[PDB]
Assembly symmetry: C3
Homo-oligomer: 418 residues x 3
């Protein structure tokens, strides 16, 4: 009778060992991870890269007759027949100027390049930048690097490219960061006389705070800043460490692109777009990097734009961009105050030779800074390693039947002898 | 002497095994969890449901003499004695309209319904919606579905109700989302001539971005949008998975509500309120769902409001809403640009046959989109499961005394003799 | 041949046990932790303390001739030679007043000057409501910061009970209508260090256990808008060494009852200024002597700036293990509505323009009646290590602690 109770106890114990062991094994092959959040104080923080664009792509006073000829349809200033659209709400002077530039009688077309057009007709930072301050000391427009995006000629402060060393901040708070007073030059905006898809009613700038290791993607990752306010941006540096397969989904390999030195998801997207447009239309857009020839406005109309839209719509499988394992993100909180005060309106108007109306509707102040001298870390950590797996299997294997790998080897010994 | 040192080693080993084993047992019985954060790229994102209200509950030009008679005191247009309050700083015409509407001389009242009054007097989406675009293609006011909230007649885009399929976005950024130009119609706002508790000075709209599975709760979960700016709202889809008892506190059961098909904490809140008001006052407010009769303004005055206030403090234990285990939340970052530009102000003024002053104080553009085509996941994960407990107990049990469950069974066997 | 493969299996098995066991040993000695996020529903939430300053340090109408004499250079209204700045863009009345106050023919405490000349909450506070019930200016406690005379609602200091809210949403919180008094702003005729073009207020939402640090931790609120602030209470629990970096011993400073990272920062600053200049600035607390405007120019400011740059290691403030933080999301609506501008203008005896350029409404509340908890939790405890080493020790060679002791005996005998 005792051998029966022993047989039942050994059988049930071996069954429990079976299901528990297969449980821990399956849990290991899920490759599970859990997250470790930490806050690290630092004596210094590397200030990020700040890219800003004017919402107006190009200045009206800088557009020329040749520009209307080649890119008149693309710039939406002229209709398909090289004639001005509906004149509703058209200033007499502006409409006469445009009508004069669109005469096109005995006109010899000069050579035209999209990057030349954006570079000269775009808003000059030397005119927009009314004042610059970093850590309380003056900055020059030479700190701003020209970057071409979908919005046109844009500028990146502290880009850290072309061998310039990146700036640091040793104190947090509103004073100890970037602080620029900009004039968005609303007088230079393209007149809107007729409704169009490209017609926009916004006035202000668009800013993206990003690491120097990634290029700007201002059309998607930027936030707007409106004239007439001083906007504060409190930043919190975040350092992210992800896990590669089979734990998570990250880009383990450096994967350097021909266009960009360091791999970033932004660089992967704009690289994918660049390759697609170069293959499909044999030309490259203004914002894209490389050595390819830039598109002509005819190529823009008949190939480039429908090609990108078709790439977005047809299938995401062509452009699948994984996230790198080491990522520096910047968190940001926005707040506003009014500019200028009644005590300063006259002084600003006289300082920049403008009317107080103009100052009120054209001046914005951007204040970008770190809230405090610390950074957060978010790390994906492996939850079950092979040492822990063997430890649990050994513990339960020793608890239920008290056997070992040598014991199973001995049972296989008798099986081979049998 | 050797058996004595052996006895000391076995005793100390058995004590240590005792305290370590009870340690792992207690840690298991705390039922602990830890969190798994992950970010997932996606080729498509389901666009959320967007509900907005005008801050002005009902239009002044649509209020009628009968409305003043029944709900004049409730709307704060008339005083306790059904008379207009002080006319201080009242436009002559503006007051003339109200004085004529509140005559009540030889007036034979007609039936009155609160939901009819809000549905007819509230701001019409056909007049507010100056332009609508979703993913660059035009939308109609018919895309917005009417929901009645505490703020009055409100509208939900991509509500996904009545069999409509939920919309998706295949690109991120400002262009590729919902983008509406609204006229908040500040001329239709209730005149404020005298101080009252209900008096408010704000002008604009209130928006809540929420999953289609939940009803809006704009009085608590909404954010404001001011006229004269294009407000960008960058959304981040977050997918949350919680643990039921005994690990955490989540809804293990489906939790069928009578009013709503899907369970949500909001649906639980307005369910608690609706049930409480039906039991105490036998009527429901406009925002509440169901089939009960709507309250009359007298019922509102003498029963509903004090009942809700008594519900907040006295019965704070009475309404307990557990959180569901699988929840889709949307995070948001707001930024603004100025509207309109000087190059467009007059074109807007002529396009909508308004003065530039009006455009300046009445037009707002709302741009709701996903920052990028990805979603975050926040999961509560069990930290100590029974397999790990048995493995650790077996490991320490085998390290300290080298025993097994069969060893203790044999010890009970020898003890049996 | 069988004993040879048995011996090799025991050798290799002991090697595997060695590397796995040392693996768990080293992993345990990393002292790792992982994060536990949780959301806790509550019937009540303790409302935070809200400190706000006007961006304008002191009122122009309250400055007197003596104040111009002593602190004229510091306040930037007068130059080093006690003369008026450039007369470009100067109000005729303001310039006549300043020249009159600067007559300096036949003609001071910093805290008296800030306390009396600063913006009075009794004039700024046009309306106050908390949970729908009226509040008085006496509920705000005066705190002196770098911005000047500032005010803290629900400060909870001096034994006052902390306020609670039993409902979430815009109505059920603090709601104040303020007049920033833009007419009292210092006239700016020439460039100066204090010169600012902003108009509005600065707010910091913080727990009562920590002092305000509004020049660094504050956000702006612009006039002409009602800004809503949705708050989410967060409770953070950190680990002390060797797991993390937290202050296990509170080691509260004499200046403040409860230890906070901010309180440690301003304590270090006060101590440094007392050591180098034998005086304390306006914002600093204690019983120490306040600086004179001459002391400010030649000692205080360069000492503070040099303290930030020269020795950043000197002030090391550890983070406490239990920290209550408040998350916040801002949004705006326009104030006043066209239907309400006239009533406000007449109610407060101001022009409709003045209301447009001076009135702001602040609405601070909890989004919902819950709070988040973020806890650092130990990933490998000594019981788990002994369990893993025991499991692998029993799987690979099947030995025990008693087995190793017996091996020491048999080795000792032979
Ligand atoms: C990602 O960041 C980690 C640190 O956060 C890097 O790990 C360091 O790698 C260097 C080798 O170049 C070592 O000298 C350091 O000791 C490592 N630090 C730690 C904490 O392990 C890692 O190399 C980075 N990965 C990439 C691809 O850049
Ligand atoms: C200010 O600008 C106007 C615009 O052309 C110009 O005529 C005037 O001379 C300028 N004044 C000064 C002082 O430069
Ligand atoms: C435009 O509005 C005015 C009143 O403001 C009205 O008289 C006129 O008929 C309107 N025109 C159109 C085309 O609606
Ligand atoms: C810290 O806060 C937690 C709740 O978040 C509480 O349980 C604990 O008692 C507090 N004190 C310590 C020393 O952890
Ligand atoms: C109202 O404002 C005027 C203009 O400054 C002032 O003279 C008058 O005294 C004010 N009324 C009161 C009651 O303060
Ligand atoms: Ba009752
Ligand atoms: Cl997992
Ligand atoms: Cl727990
Ligand atoms: Cl670790």
């Amino acid at each position: 009778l005792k051998r029966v109770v022993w047989a039942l106890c050994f059988m049930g114990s071996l069954a429990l060992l079976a299901l528990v062991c297969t449980n821990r094994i399956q849990y290991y092959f899920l490759y599970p991870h859990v997250t470790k959040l930490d806050e690290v104080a630092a004596t210094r923080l590397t200030f990020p890269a700040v890219t800003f664009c004017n919402l107006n792509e190009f200045r009206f006073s800088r557009v020329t007759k040749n520009d209307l000829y080649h890119a008149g349809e693309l710039l939406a200033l002229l209709n398909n027949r090289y004639e001005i659209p509906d004149t509703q709400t058209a200033d007499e002077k502006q409409l006469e100027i445009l009508q004069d530039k669109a005469n096109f009688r005995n006109f010899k077309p000069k050579p035209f390049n999209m990057l030349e057009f954006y570079d000269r007709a775009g808003h000059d930072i030397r005119e927009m930048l009314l004042s610059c301050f970093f850590r309380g000391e003056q900055c020059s427009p030479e700190d701003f690097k020209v970057v071409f995006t979908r919005y046109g000629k844009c500028y990146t402060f502290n880009a850290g490219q072309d061998g310039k060393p990146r700036l640091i901040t040793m104190k947090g708070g509103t004073g100890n960061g970037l602080e620029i007073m900009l004039d968005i030059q609303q007088d230079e905006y393209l007149p809107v006389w007729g409704e169009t898809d490209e017609t926009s009613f916004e006035a202000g700038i668009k800013v993206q705070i990003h690491s120097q290791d990634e290029p700007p993607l201002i059309d998607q990752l930027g936030f707007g800043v409106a004239p007439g306010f001083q906007t504060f941006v409190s930043c919190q540096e975040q350092r992210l460490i992800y896990l590669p397969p089979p734990w998570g989904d990250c880009k383990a390999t450096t994967g350097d692109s021909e266009f960009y030195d360091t791999y970033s998801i932004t660089a992967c997207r704009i690289d994918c777009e660049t390759r697609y447009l170069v293959e499909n239309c044999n030309c490259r857009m203004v914002h894209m990097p490389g050595d390819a020839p830039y598109c002509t406005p005819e190529q823009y109309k008949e190939c480039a734009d429908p090609a990108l839209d078709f790439l977005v719509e047809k299938d995401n499988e062509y452009c699948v961009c994984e996230m790198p394992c080491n990522v520096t993100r910047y968190g940001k909180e926005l707040s506003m105050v009014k500019i200028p005060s009644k005590a300063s309106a006259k002084y600003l108007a006289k300082k920049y030779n403008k009317s107080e109306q103009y100052i009120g509707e054209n001046i914005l102040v951007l204040d970008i800074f770190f809230e405090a001298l610390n950074y957060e870390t978010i790390e994906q950590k492996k939850a079950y390693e092979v040492a822990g797996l063997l430890g649990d299997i050994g513990g339960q294997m020793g608890l239920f039947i008290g056997a070992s790998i040598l014991t199973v080897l001995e049972l296989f010994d008798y099986a081979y002898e049998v």
